Amino acid sequence: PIETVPVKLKPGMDGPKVKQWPLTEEKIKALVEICTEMEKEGKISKIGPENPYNTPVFAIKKKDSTKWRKLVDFRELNKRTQDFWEVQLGIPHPAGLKKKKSVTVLDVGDAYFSVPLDEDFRKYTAFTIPSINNETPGIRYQYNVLPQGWKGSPAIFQSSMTKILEPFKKQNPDIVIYQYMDDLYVGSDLEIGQHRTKIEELRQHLLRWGFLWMGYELHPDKWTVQPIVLPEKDSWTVNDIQKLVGKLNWASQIYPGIKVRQLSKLLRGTKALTEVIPLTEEAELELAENREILKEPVHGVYYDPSKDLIAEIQKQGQGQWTYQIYQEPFKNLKTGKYARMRGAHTNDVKQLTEAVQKITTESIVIWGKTPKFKLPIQKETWETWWTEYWQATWIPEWEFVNTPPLVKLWYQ
C-alpha cells in the first residue's frame, strides 16, 4: 500500500490538544518498551516541539492476557476527524448479527499497521509517554500507519478488508461478519463446536493473507426489553400496595391504560404500613388488567440512527447491575441485568467498568455504535480508576449521575 488516502479534519477545527493523565511507573515502562519496538518497525516516529497536538495514551491487559498493551484514547481526534464515506455512502449495519446463535469477536487491529497514514495528517496523532514527577520531558511520538482506535482506520482499510474476507465469505454465505473499529464480529447459528471450528478456520485464513489468537463469544439470542413484572402475593400489606401503586404509576408513563384507582381504594384511611389489606375483586381485576398490558411491547419504539443511544446503569447491590438503552425517555430499545461480575466481588468500580464494556459490546452488535453512558458514580472516583480495568480498544462517552434516581426501585 504505497499510496496514502488523503485525510482531513473537519472545517474550522484544529487537531486535538488533550492532556496526558498521570501513569504509574509500571505502565510507563510497558509503554516505553512497546513504543521502542513500534519505532524500530517504523509504525511511529519521534516528533519535535513544532507539533503541539496530543492524544492521551495508557496501558492495559486484554481479557485473559498477561502482556501489557497500549491503548490510545482517540475520542477527541475521532470527533475532529472528517466524516467518512471511503468506499460507498455507508455500510448498512447488518441487522442479522444480533439474531445469530453465537457471535465471536476477533481482534484484527494488527492489520492496520500495514497501511501508511497520510503524511499530512500524521501530526494529529501525536501522543506522549509521560515521565514520572516531570523529571524528564515526555517521549513524543506520532503515527506513520493507520492507528488502532482511530475512526479513519477501518474506513481507509475497508477496501482491503473486504477482499481478504471474500473467499471465506464466498463459501460460508450464512456467516455474518461485521467490523467495528479494531474488531470483527463473526456470528453463526450452528453447533457451538461447529461454530468454533468455522471461527478457527476464519483465523487461519487471515494468517495466509498476512491475528492475535484471542476471541470473544456472545449469544445475542437473548437481548430484548425485559418485561415489567408485578408481585404475586396471597396477602398484601399497606406498604406492598403503596409500592405497587408507585411502580404502576411509573409504568403508566410507558404503557397506556394502566389504572391504579381500585388498588388505591384499598388504602382508604390512615393505616399502619405493616397492616395486611385483603384485595377486593375490583382491585384483583385491575391488577390482572395491568398485568395483561405489561405483557405486550411498548408502543412505537424505533431506532433512529441520527440520534445518540443513551445507556443508564443502576447499582442494585450484591454484584447486580440493571441497565436500559434508549434514545427517548420511556422508549427503551433494550434493558438488561448483570450479576456476579467477573473477578470483582469487592470492587464497585471494576464491576461498573465491566458492565460499561459489556453494554457497549451489545450496542455495537445491535446498532453498530456505542451509547452515551449515565454512570451512578462521582466523576473524580470514576476518572481515577476506570482505566485500571478497561480491556477494550474502543472507549464510549459518559456523564455522571449525582442524584439517586427513584426508578432504581422499579427495575429491582
Add this chain to the structure above:
Amino acid sequence: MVPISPIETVPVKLKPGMDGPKVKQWPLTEEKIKALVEICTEMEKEGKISKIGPENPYNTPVFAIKKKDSTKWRKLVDFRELNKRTQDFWEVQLGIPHPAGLKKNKSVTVLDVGDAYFSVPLDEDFRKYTAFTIPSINNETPGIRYQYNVLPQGWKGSPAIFQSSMTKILEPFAAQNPDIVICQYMDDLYVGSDLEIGQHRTKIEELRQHLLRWGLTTPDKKHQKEPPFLWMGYELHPDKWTVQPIVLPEKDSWTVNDIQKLVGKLNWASQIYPGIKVRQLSKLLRGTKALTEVIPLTEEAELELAENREILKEPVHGVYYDPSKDLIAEIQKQGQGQWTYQIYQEPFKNLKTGKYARMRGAHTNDVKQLTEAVQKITTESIVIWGKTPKFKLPIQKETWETWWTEYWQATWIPEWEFVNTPPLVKLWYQLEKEPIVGAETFYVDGAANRETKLGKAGYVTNKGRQKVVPLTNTTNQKTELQAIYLALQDSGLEVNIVTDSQYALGIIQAQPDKSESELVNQIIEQLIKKEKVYLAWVPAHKGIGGNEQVDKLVSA
C-alpha cells in the same frame, strides 16, 4: 578545525492565514542609536544576526534600555506582535518536579549553558519574520536592518525549541549513563549522581566531551551556589528539602489583597507544614474584585491565622524518596469540610504533606469527602512517585463496608487500613429497608401558595395523631421537608414516614450528614436521635389513604 555536528533545525510556521509582523520602528535618541549599532555589530560578528536588504517587508520594533549601575545600554526587540502570529508549540516545561519525588544524589555539578543556547539555529525559512530596524542618525540614511539566525530571546518558540534541542543532544549520554540525573534551569544545567566525587567528576568531563560534538562549551556556573539550591520556591538540601521561608506578617488592617497573599503562602506551605488550614481565611474572599477593601477578620479567621502561626513557628522539612520503602498516606479530618494528610515512608519523616477542601455543595457527608481526598492523594502520588500509596484512614473497616454495600453509587478506595485518630469518620444514620412492625406510621405532606408564599406542613398517623402548622415565606419543597421534620420531632424512637415528595426523598437518599439548609440539618439531627426510621414514597394525588388525608389538610 574539529568538525562539529549541526544542531537539528526545527521547522517553524506562522499561524494559518496570518502574515509576519509589520510594526513601525519608533524614533530613538542619537545616544540609543549609537548604543544599538555597537551591540548589533557585535551580535553580527558572533553569527546571531545578519544584515538584510530592503526587500524584506517585515519589521519588529527595537528599543534601548539600561540598568542603573550597569553602565551600558541594553537592546530590546519587542516580538509581542510576531508571537501573536507564530504557531503554537509543545511547551515541554509546564510542570516542574516535586522535591518529594526526587531521590538523593550526593554529588551535583552546575554547568552554564548560556552560550550553547546561541548554537541553536533558527529555521532559515522563518528568519525573515524576525527583521528589525535600527533608525539612522537624523534619519538621513536608510535604517540598518537585521534578522535573526538564532532563537531570539522573547520570541514565542525559543523556550520550547531550546529545551527540546538540549534534550535530544543529551539523550544518548543520559541513556548510556543511567546513574546520573540532569535538569536544566534557565541557563543552568544541573548534573547529579550518587557516585564518589572522583567518579562523578569523570562523568562531568565525559558529558563535556559529549557536548563538544556540537561545539558546546560548558564551564561551571559563576559563583557556585552552596546549599541549599534555591529552585522554584524550594530549598533543596543534600538530604532534606523544604519550602523557602514562610513568614506571616503582623497587621491590624487586612485588605482583600493582604488575605490573598496569606492564602498563597499558606497553600504553598501546606505541602510540608502539616495541619495548615485556609477555610476561614478563604471565606473572607467569597466574592470580591477590589483588593484594597479592608475586610475585618472574624474571630474564626483570627483563630485560624494564629493556628497557622503556631504551625509556622518552627521550620519543618521533608525527606527524599526511597524506592525500596513503602509509600504511606495518612488523612485526618480537621472540620468544616477540611482535611489534611501526610505522605511518608518512615514514621515521622514526611516526604510531603497536603490538604483537601470540601467541594461546594448544598449537602454532603464525611465519607464522601474522605473518598474524594483519597482520590486526590492517589492522583498526586502517581504524579510524584508513579504509584498509589497505602492509606491509613480514620474510618472503621466495618463502617466503610456498610457504606459501600448500601450506597446507591459505585465507590472504591484503594488498599487502606484503619488508624484510630479522632475524630473518626462515621455513618450518622441509616434508614430501614423494610417497614417497622409496631412503629407508628406518619403520613406527611406540605404545600405552599406560589404567589403569597404561605404554606402548611403536617402529618396524620395510624393512631389518630395529627398536626398542621401554618407557615409564611415558604415553598412547596420547603413545606415538604418541614412536614418530615415535624413527624421526626413528634414520633418515638422508631417511626415509619410516608411522603410523596420526590425532592425530599432525593435529598435524604443521598445520605447527607450536613447541609447548607438549616432545615435539612435539623432533619439530620432528628434522624441521628432515632433508633429506626423507614422512609417510604408514594405518588401524589392518587387517592393513597393517609396521603390523601394530609394532602387536603395542607392544601389550604
